[PDB]
Coordinates of C-alpha atoms in Angstrom, one line a residue:
Chain R
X1 CA -0.1 -0.1 -0.2
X2 CA 2.9 2.3 0.9
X3 CA 4.6 2.2 -2.4
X4 CA 1.7 4.2 -4.2
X5 CA 1.8 6.9 -1.5
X6 CA 5.3 8.3 -1.8
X7 CA 5.7 10.3 -5.2
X8 CA 8.4 9.2 -7.7
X9 CA 10.9 11.8 -9.0
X10 CA 14.4 11.9 -10.5
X11 CA 16.6 13.9 -8.2
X12 CA 15.5 16.5 -5.4
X13 CA 15.8 20.1 -6.1
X14 CA 19.0 21.2 -4.2
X15 CA 20.1 24.5 -2.9
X16 CA 22.5 26.2 -5.1
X17 CA 22.9 29.9 -4.0
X18 CA 21.7 30.8 -7.5
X19 CA 18.4 32.5 -8.1
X20 CA 17.4 33.7 -11.7
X21 CA 14.7 36.3 -12.3
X22 CA 13.1 36.8 -15.9
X23 CA 11.9 40.4 -16.7
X24 CA 9.5 40.6 -19.5
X25 CA 7.5 44.0 -19.9
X26 CA 4.2 44.0 -22.0
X27 CA 6.0 43.6 -25.4
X28 CA 6.0 46.1 -28.2
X29 CA 7.9 48.1 -25.5
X30 CA 11.1 50.1 -25.7
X31 CA 14.2 49.8 -23.5
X32 CA 13.1 52.7 -20.9
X33 CA 10.2 50.5 -19.6
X34 CA 12.4 47.3 -19.3
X35 CA 15.1 49.4 -17.5
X36 CA 12.6 50.9 -15.1
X37 CA 11.3 47.6 -14.1
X38 CA 14.9 46.1 -13.8
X39 CA 16.0 49.1 -11.7
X40 CA 13.1 48.8 -9.3
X41 CA 13.7 45.1 -9.0
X42 CA 17.5 45.8 -8.2
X43 CA 16.2 48.4 -5.4
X44 CA 13.9 45.9 -4.0
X45 CA 16.4 43.0 -3.8
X46 CA 19.3 45.3 -2.3
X47 CA 17.3 47.3 0.4
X48 CA 14.5 45.0 1.4
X49 CA 16.3 41.5 1.1
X50 CA 19.8 42.2 1.8
Chain V
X1 CA 2.9 53.5 -47.7
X2 CA 2.6 51.7 -44.4
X3 CA 0.3 49.1 -42.8
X4 CA 0.8 47.8 -39.1
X5 CA 0.4 44.1 -39.2
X6 CA 0.9 41.1 -36.7
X7 CA 3.7 38.6 -36.0
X8 CA 5.9 37.0 -33.3
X9 CA 9.4 38.2 -32.7
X10 CA 10.9 34.7 -31.9
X11 CA 10.2 32.0 -34.2
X12 CA 11.3 28.3 -33.4
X13 CA 11.6 25.3 -35.2
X14 CA 12.0 21.7 -34.1
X15 CA 13.1 18.8 -36.4
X16 CA 12.6 20.9 -39.5
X17 CA 9.0 22.1 -38.7
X18 CA 7.9 25.1 -36.8
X19 CA 7.0 24.9 -33.2
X20 CA 6.4 26.5 -29.8
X21 CA 7.6 25.5 -26.5
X22 CA 5.7 25.0 -23.2
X23 CA 7.8 25.0 -19.8
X24 CA 6.4 24.2 -16.6
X25 CA 6.6 21.9 -13.5
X26 CA 4.3 19.5 -11.7
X27 CA 2.4 19.9 -8.5
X28 CA 4.3 20.0 -5.1
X29 CA 3.0 16.7 -4.2
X30 CA 2.3 14.8 -7.5
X31 CA 4.9 12.8 -9.5
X32 CA 6.3 13.3 -12.9
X33 CA 4.1 10.6 -14.4
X34 CA 1.1 12.4 -13.2
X35 CA 2.1 15.6 -15.0
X36 CA 3.1 13.4 -18.1
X37 CA -0.4 12.0 -18.0
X38 CA -2.1 15.3 -17.7
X39 CA -0.3 16.7 -20.6
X40 CA -1.5 13.6 -22.4
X41 CA -4.9 14.7 -21.6
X42 CA -4.5 18.2 -22.6
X43 CA -2.9 17.3 -26.0
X44 CA -6.0 15.3 -26.9
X45 CA -8.1 18.4 -27.0
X46 CA -6.0 20.2 -29.5
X47 CA -6.9 20.6 -33.1
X48 CA -5.9 18.0 -35.9
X49 CA -2.5 19.3 -37.6
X50 CA -0.4 19.7 -34.6
Chain O
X1 CA 8.1 74.5 -41.7
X2 CA 4.6 75.5 -43.2
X3 CA 1.6 74.0 -41.3
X4 CA -1.1 72.1 -42.7
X5 CA -4.0 72.0 -40.2
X6 CA -5.2 72.8 -36.8
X7 CA -7.1 70.1 -35.0
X8 CA -9.5 71.4 -32.5
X9 CA -10.3 69.3 -29.4
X10 CA -7.7 66.6 -30.0
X11 CA -7.2 63.6 -27.7
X12 CA -3.9 61.9 -27.4
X13 CA -3.6 58.3 -26.3
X14 CA 0.2 57.5 -25.0
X15 CA 2.1 54.9 -26.8
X16 CA 1.7 52.4 -23.8
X17 CA -2.0 52.0 -24.1
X18 CA -2.3 51.5 -27.8
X19 CA -1.5 48.2 -29.5
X20 CA -2.8 46.2 -32.5
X21 CA -5.0 43.2 -32.5
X22 CA -4.8 40.2 -35.0
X23 CA -6.1 42.1 -37.9
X24 CA -3.9 45.4 -37.9
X25 CA -6.4 47.9 -36.3
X26 CA -5.5 49.8 -33.5
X27 CA -6.9 49.1 -30.0
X28 CA -6.8 50.5 -26.5
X29 CA -8.3 49.0 -23.3
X30 CA -10.6 51.5 -21.4
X31 CA -12.4 51.2 -18.1
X32 CA -16.2 51.6 -18.1
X33 CA -18.0 53.8 -15.4
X34 CA -19.0 50.5 -13.5
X35 CA -15.2 49.7 -13.3
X36 CA -14.7 46.9 -15.8
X37 CA -12.5 46.9 -18.8
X38 CA -13.3 46.3 -22.4
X39 CA -11.7 46.0 -25.9
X40 CA -12.4 49.1 -28.3
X41 CA -11.0 49.7 -31.7
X42 CA -9.8 53.2 -32.3
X43 CA -8.0 54.7 -35.4
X44 CA -4.7 56.0 -34.7
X45 CA -2.2 56.8 -37.5
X46 CA 0.0 59.9 -36.5
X47 CA 2.7 59.9 -33.9
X48 CA 3.0 63.6 -32.5
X49 CA 5.6 63.6 -29.6
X50 CA 5.3 60.2 -27.8
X51 CA 1.3 60.1 -28.3
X52 CA -0.9 58.8 -31.1
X53 CA -3.2 61.4 -32.6
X54 CA -6.4 59.3 -32.0
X55 CA -9.1 60.5 -34.3
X56 CA -11.8 58.2 -33.6
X57 CA -13.0 55.7 -30.9
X58 CA -11.8 57.3 -27.7
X59 CA -13.6 60.2 -26.3
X60 CA -13.1 62.8 -23.7
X61 CA -12.9 61.8 -19.9
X62 CA -12.5 58.2 -20.4
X63 CA -9.7 56.1 -18.6
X64 CA -7.4 54.1 -20.8
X65 CA -4.8 51.9 -18.9
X66 CA -1.0 51.8 -19.8
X67 CA 0.5 49.2 -17.6
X68 CA -1.0 45.8 -16.5
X69 CA -2.4 45.2 -19.9
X70 CA -1.1 41.5 -19.8
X71 CA -2.3 40.9 -16.2
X72 CA -5.9 41.5 -17.6
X73 CA -8.5 40.2 -20.3
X74 CA -11.3 42.0 -21.8
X75 CA -14.2 41.9 -19.4
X76 CA -13.0 41.5 -15.7
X77 CA -13.4 44.1 -12.8
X78 CA -10.3 46.0 -12.2
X79 CA -9.0 48.9 -9.8
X80 CA -8.1 52.2 -11.1
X81 CA -4.8 53.9 -9.8
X82 CA -2.7 56.8 -11.3
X83 CA -0.3 55.2 -13.7
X84 CA 3.3 56.3 -13.0
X85 CA 4.6 54.7 -16.0
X86 CA 3.7 57.6 -18.4
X87 CA 5.5 61.0 -18.5
Chain A
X1 CA 6.1 41.0 -4.4
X2 CA 7.0 40.5 -8.1
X3 CA 3.2 40.1 -8.7
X4 CA 3.0 43.7 -7.1
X5 CA 5.1 45.1 -10.2
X6 CA 1.9 46.0 -12.1
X7 CA 4.1 47.1 -15.3
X8 CA 5.8 43.9 -16.2
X9 CA 5.4 40.2 -16.2
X10 CA 8.1 39.1 -13.9
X11 CA 8.7 35.2 -13.2
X12 CA 11.2 34.3 -10.5
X13 CA 12.7 30.7 -10.9
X14 CA 15.6 28.6 -9.5
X15 CA 17.8 26.4 -11.4
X16 CA 17.5 22.7 -11.0
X17 CA 19.8 20.3 -9.3
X18 CA 22.0 19.0 -12.2
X19 CA 22.8 22.4 -14.2
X20 CA 23.9 20.6 -17.2
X21 CA 20.4 19.0 -17.9
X22 CA 18.6 22.3 -18.5
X23 CA 18.0 25.7 -17.1
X24 CA 14.8 25.4 -15.1
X25 CA 12.8 22.6 -13.1
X26 CA 10.2 20.4 -14.3
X27 CA 9.3 19.1 -17.6
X28 CA 9.3 20.8 -21.2
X29 CA 7.7 19.8 -24.4
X30 CA 7.6 21.5 -28.1
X31 CA 4.4 21.8 -29.4
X32 CA 5.0 21.6 -33.2
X33 CA 3.0 21.4 -36.3
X34 CA 3.3 18.9 -39.2
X35 CA 0.9 19.7 -42.2
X36 CA 1.5 23.6 -42.4
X37 CA -1.8 24.6 -40.6
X38 CA -0.4 28.1 -40.1
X39 CA 1.6 30.3 -37.7
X40 CA -1.3 31.9 -36.3
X41 CA -3.5 28.8 -35.7
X42 CA -0.4 27.3 -34.1
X43 CA 0.0 30.5 -31.7
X44 CA -3.9 30.0 -31.0
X45 CA -3.3 26.3 -30.2
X46 CA -0.5 27.2 -27.9
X47 CA -2.7 29.8 -26.1
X48 CA -5.6 27.0 -25.9
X49 CA -2.8 24.6 -24.2
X50 CA -1.7 27.2 -21.8

C-alpha cells in the first residue's frame, strides 16, 4: 500500500545559492520601460532582502 | 505606404518544422508521471494538424 | 515648416496604451463607469510627440490603461490607480 | 512581490539540481505542427494549451 503513497521523481531540487529572475514587459515596448522594471527590481532585492 | 500587421518576434523550429515551447513543473505533491499523463489529456483536445 | 491644419479638441492616447489586434487595427483598453475593462477599436495613425493622434473611438474623459495590460483580459473587474509609467 | 510590479510580467525561478540537464525545473515539450496549418493557428493552439 505504501509504494503508491510516496511520489516518484528523478533527483531532489537542491540549494545552489543561485536564483534567476526573468523580466518581461508587455512587449512592443522600448528599453526605457524594461530598464525601469529592472532598476526597481534591483532596488527591492538590495534594500529589502539584503 | 505603411500598414501595421501582426507577427511573433521569436520564431522556433524543431526537427525541421515550426514549433512553440511549453515549460512548466508538476504539483508540489504529485509525481512526474502524473504531469506526463495530464499533458497527455491536454494534447488530446488540440486541433488536428499539430 | 509650413503648417497643414489645426485640429480642435484633440485627444492623445500615449504609446503604452495603444496596440494592435490580430487584423492590424489599433486598439486601447478602457475602463467603464461600472469599473470593468473592455476592448475598443480606435483609429490612430499619426505620432505626435510620444502620443498617438487618435481621431476616432476614444472620447473625452475616459480612462485608458497603460500598464497591467497583460495581467488583464477584456471583461473583468479592475481597480484604477494613477499610472506612474507615463511621462 | 513581483506580482506587485503592475508594469511587467516578472517570473522568478530557481535552477535545477543538475545544471547540465537544463535551465529550470520540471518538464518541457515542443508543441509543433506537421501539415503547415499556419503560424497564427499554431499560436492559437499554444494559447489553448496554456
